[PDB]
Structure 1
Amino acid sequence: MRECISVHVGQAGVQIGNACWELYCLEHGIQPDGQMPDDSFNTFFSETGAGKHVPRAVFVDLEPTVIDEVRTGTYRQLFHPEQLITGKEDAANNYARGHYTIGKELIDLVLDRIRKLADQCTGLQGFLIFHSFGGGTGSGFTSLLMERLSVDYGKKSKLEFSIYPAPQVSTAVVEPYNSILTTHTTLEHSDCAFMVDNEAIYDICRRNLDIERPTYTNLNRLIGQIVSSITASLRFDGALNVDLTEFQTNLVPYPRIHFPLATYAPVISAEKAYHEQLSVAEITNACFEPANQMVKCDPRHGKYMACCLLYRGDVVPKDVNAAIATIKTKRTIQFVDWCPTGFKVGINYQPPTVVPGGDLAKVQRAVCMLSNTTAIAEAWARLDHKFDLMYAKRAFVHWYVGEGMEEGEFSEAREDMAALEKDYEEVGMDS
């Protein structure tokens, strides 16, 4: 009954999705073939007529190399033949070839499939989108989608997971451009945008865990569990539950301010775990620690405005209350002036599920802290500056104006990210 459609736009989306879907298949016992050897599956899967629980997701990527791997692999049976969608060429790290050229060609098939997946649902409760600002599909095709779903499912919340341009580590040279031009056309359409960089999660893999040489695979599995923790209340049982809509209404202040972060709690390796207690107090405090955040943005350089401590497992409601009280005292963690509470909680009586072949341990407790910090302005100002430096000498702008995009769009995008900055300042000021 309470179902949520997950859309994977871009290499990232698919790669991270091949990790998120693996976990779901395990939590709700569904073997790769798609068979369950009672109703928790509804939130994510949909039963056919012969135990063929088929994922309620849509995987789209213009370039057919990442989705072809899914088609020829373990989950070749799970995913519906036509739920995996491809094209021919790529957006070649260019927003234009995803929001103006190639994109158009695939938007009326991706959209038609979402409709079919939403018409078989009885309670669509949200559209989760897994994009990657840097790419042209994770910035362009995702803009088309969010600029379309808005004019088709206005009320339906549209939460958004997003690999954000990491501070210094970056792949493409035009990532600065794609990101700015895409926030302009996604800030007014998404409800809340969960952001995770790559620098931070890389560190969390080496230190907190024990994985030297961490790859995308590892990163995607921790992002996978953040989704499980958020969607758990909608599929398992708990003491204080929290549905998709209840996230936004307790996390998004002044409309535009809608860019929360994500920190897991028991990100410990096997050897280490055994030698540790992992109590509500510990995992809670570990979450607020400025070296467990997954978007390098020194929490201390700003004020939190609405945290959402979503727990999972053995969490005695009392310990939770106590733990959060402690956090309020410690002044390092400073909240704003217009948010006395700013602590929506949530307990789902379902222990974290070990991905047979992951890196995390069998912890019987976890918390996923979604915080609306005002420190993300630093990160946003960084990308903003990069733009200016390149745009000054109209750098890679010939490539963007050839696939459809006036030089004006660049200017609006810059002046609009400037508004984002100004807003965040006028939300940190006191009364």
Structure 2
Amino acid sequence: MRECISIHVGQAGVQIGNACWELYCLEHGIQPDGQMPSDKTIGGGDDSFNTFFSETGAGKHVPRAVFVDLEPTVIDEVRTGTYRQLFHPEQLITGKEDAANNYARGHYTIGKEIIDLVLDRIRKLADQCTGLQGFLVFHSFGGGTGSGFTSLLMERLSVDYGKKSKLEFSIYPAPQVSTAVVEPYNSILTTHTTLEHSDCAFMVDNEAIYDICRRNLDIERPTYTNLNRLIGQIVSSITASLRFDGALNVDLTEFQTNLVPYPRIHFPLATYAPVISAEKAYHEQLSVAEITNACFEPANQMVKCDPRHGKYMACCLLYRGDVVPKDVNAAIATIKTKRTIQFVDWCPTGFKVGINYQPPTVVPGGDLAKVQRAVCMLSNTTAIAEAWARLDHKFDLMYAKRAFVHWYVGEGMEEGEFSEAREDMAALEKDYEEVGVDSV
């Protein structure tokens, strides 16, 4: 009744759909065959699995997922992994050759034969659910499938459903260490489709998540799979309020109502507070004040921007576990007093809280500790006009000598986007400071 249909695009999407869906089989007690042994759940209403799982004709729960790639060698690990019987066979889509760090290939030439088969399966998971809240998108800016085809799938998700909610939790490129060369041509040219055809949009930079797992957790030499875990903890806390019982629930519409003041302005910042190890969980109590102050600490963000340069426009606090409304409201009063955090002059109240009783679930082979409490916070700031400005820094630097652009024209891309879709980004670079400048 309160369903949410994930869509994961690309190798980044598929490798995140291997960590998100391992979390949801321990959160609701699903063995990797699909079976649930115990009909009762420890904190919910015996149908908490309906936002993600669905009953079938064997007593078997099958997810509401579609995995997309333009390449077989990352999804055939899923089809021969431990969870090979959890997934329906047509929910994992593969092509035969990849778009290969390019926009026009995955948008105009190669993306055109996987645009039709996917929309047969999207309209099947969205006809089973009577109460769909909205899709979720897990894509990557710097690929060929996660940028060319995702902008092709957003553009046709607009007309087939209209004003349905769609959220993307994307991987923007890092400011320092990107794995590619022609990533900035793809990364700029999809920033149009996240502004028109998107309802909310978060950004993670893997260089920023490297700074946490090396520092807060004690994993020297992490991998991508000690980073895919922490993105599942953000996603679960967002939709934990749908599944398990709580004092104040927050849906997906109470997100957009409170932190999206204007429809050109939907880029908040994801932060998850008690990221500590079980040798440093022994030392410090983890009260509500110690987990609501650490989100405001700029070293703990999941993007490479600092909100001391920006004006906080709105916020969204999400509390899991052993939290009382007495102490949630008690430590909100402290952060108003300090002058390090500054709100904009037209948002006087500026908050929203959500309390879920269910403590977050730890995984075997995992890395965190089992904690009583947690906080996920999504604040949107005028400190995004510095993240965009470190990619005009390197689009114009490369495009001035017209370097790689022969790859794009002969695949079907007109030359307009190399002058338009950066000036498309110039306005949203200029909007964000005007909507955060003081009254006259």
CA distance in 2, matches of 1:206, 1:23: 22
Q: Deviations over 1:69-107 (max 9, x none)?
A: 101101101111000000011110101111111111101
Instruction: Check the 8 A contact 1:303/1:334 in 2, yes or no.
Output: yes
What are the Cα deviations for residues 260-307 of structure 1, in whole angstroms up to 9, with x where unaligned?
111101100010011111110110001110011010101211111111
Give the distance between the partners of 1:120 and 1:2, measured in 2 at CA.
Answer: 12
Question: Secondary structure at the residue paired with 1:138?
Answer: helix
Per-residue displacement from partner, 1:46-83 (whole Å, max 9, x unpaired)? 11022210010100000111111101101101111000
Find the aligned partners of 2:119 and 2:368 in 1 and give their Cα distance: 36
Q: Post-superposition shift, 1:186? A: 2.5
Tell me which stretches of 4 or more aligned residues in structure 1 moved more than 2 Å. Answer: none
d(CA) in 2 for partners of 1:198, 1:376: 17
Q: Helix, strand or coil for the counterpart of 1:100?
A: helix
* Residues 138-160 of structure 1: per-residue CA shift (max 9 Å, x gap): 11111111111111122210011
Q: Structure 1, residues 87-140: CA drift from partner, whole Å, max 9, x if none?
A: 011110101111111111101111110100000001110110000111111111
Separation in 2, partners of 1:404, 1:330 = 54
Return the offset for 1:185. 2.0
SS at match of 1:118: helix
Give CA deviations for 1:189-214 in whole Å, capped at 9, x if unaligned. 11010111111111110111100001
Using the TM superposition, name which of 243-252 and 264-273 deviates more. Answer: 243-252
Match of 1:143 in 2: 151
Shift of 1:245: 1.4
How far apart are residue 11 of structure 1 and its match?
0.6
Paired with 1:327 and 1:286, the residues of 2 have a C-alpha distance of 11
- Conserved? CA contact 2:135–2:166, under 8 Å: yes
Q: What whole-Å deviation, never above 9, does each CA across 1:318-372 have from its counterpart, x for those lacking one?
A: 1111111111221111111111122111011110100121101001111101111
Structure 1: distance between partners of 2:331 and 2:107: 46
Structure 1 Cα separation of the partners of residues 226 and 310 of structure 2: 29
Q: Tell me the CA shift for residue 377 of structure 1.
A: 1.0
Partners in 2 of 1:234 and 1:16 — Cα distance?
21
Give, in angstroms, the shift of residue 396 of structure 1: 1.1
Kept in 2, the 8 Å contact 1:147–1:186? The answer is no
**Secondary structure, in 3 states, of the residue corresponding to 1:278?**
coil
Does the aligned pair in 2 maintain the 1:312–1:351 contact within 8 Å?
yes
Distance 2:191 2:153 in 1: 13
More helix by share: 1
For 1:141 and 1:351, locate their aligned partners in 2 and report how far apart those are by CA, in whole Å: 37
Task: Give yes or no for the alignment of 1:322 onto 2:330.
Answer: yes
Please state whether the residue corresponding to 1:68 is helix, strand or coil: coil
CA distance in 2, matches of 1:116, 1:148: 16
Contact 2:194/2:201 (<8 A) preserved: no
Aligned residue for 2:83, secondary structure, equals: helix
Q: Secondary structure at the match of 1:419?
A: helix
Could you list the per-position Cα deviations for residues 170-227 of structure 1 after superposition, in whole angstroms to 9, with x for gaps in the alignment?
A: 0111111111100112210110101111111111101111000011001110001100
Q: Structure 2 CA distance, aligned partners of 1:323 and 1:174? A: 46
| Unpaired stretches in structure 2, ≥5 consecutive residues | 38-45
C-alpha distance in 1, partners of 2:101/2:156? 22
SS of equivalent to 1:421: helix
CA contact (8 A) 1:17 1:224 kept: no
Partner SS for 1:3: coil
Give the whole-Å Cα distance in 1 for the aligned partners of 2:345 and 2:165.
Answer: 28
Which residue number corresponds to residue 166 of structure 1? 174
Distance 2:149 2:178 in 1: 21
Partner residue of 2:41? none
Distance 1:212 1:172 in 2: 24
2:6 corresponding residue in structure 1: 6
* Mapped partners of 2:187, 2:74: distance in 1: 22
| CA deviations over 1:25-44 (Å, ceiling 9, x no partner) | 11011111111112111011
Q: Is the 1:96–1:404 Cα contact (8 Å) retained in structure 2?
A: yes
The one-character-per-residue Cα deviations of 1:216-251 (angstroms, maximum 9, x if unpaired) are 001110001100000111111111111111111111
Q: Which residue of 2 aligns with 1:33?
A: 33
C-alpha separation between the residues in 2 aligned to 1:145 and 1:30? Answer: 31
**Secondary structure at 1:97's aligned position in 2?**
helix
Aligned identity (percent) is: 99
Worse overlay, 22-31 or 249-258: 249-258
CA distance in 2, matches of 1:427, 1:175: 30
Q: Is the partner of 1:124 in helix, strand or coil?
A: coil
For 2:193 and 2:352, how far apart are their aligned partners in 1?
A: 29
Q: Do 2:200 and 2:256's aligned partners in 1 also have CA atoms closer than 8 Å?
A: yes
SS at match of 2:66: strand
Q: What is the rounded CA distance, in whole Å, between the counterparts of 1:416 and 1:26 in structure 2? A: 44
For the 8 Å contact 1:263–1:294, the answer to whether it is kept is yes
CA distance in 2, matches of 1:214, 1:47: 37
The two structures have a TM-score, normalised by structure 1, of 0.99
The residue number in structure 1 matching 2:85 is 77
Q: Distance in 1 between matches of 2:394 and 2:324?
A: 47
The answer on whether the counterparts of 2:321 and 2:360 sit within 8 Å (CA) in structure 1 is: yes
Distance in 2 (CA, whole Å) between partners of 1:371 and 1:153 is 28
Shift of 1:385: 1.8
SS in 1 for 2:281: helix
Q: Contact conserved, 2:202 with 2:270, CA < 8 A, in 1?
A: yes
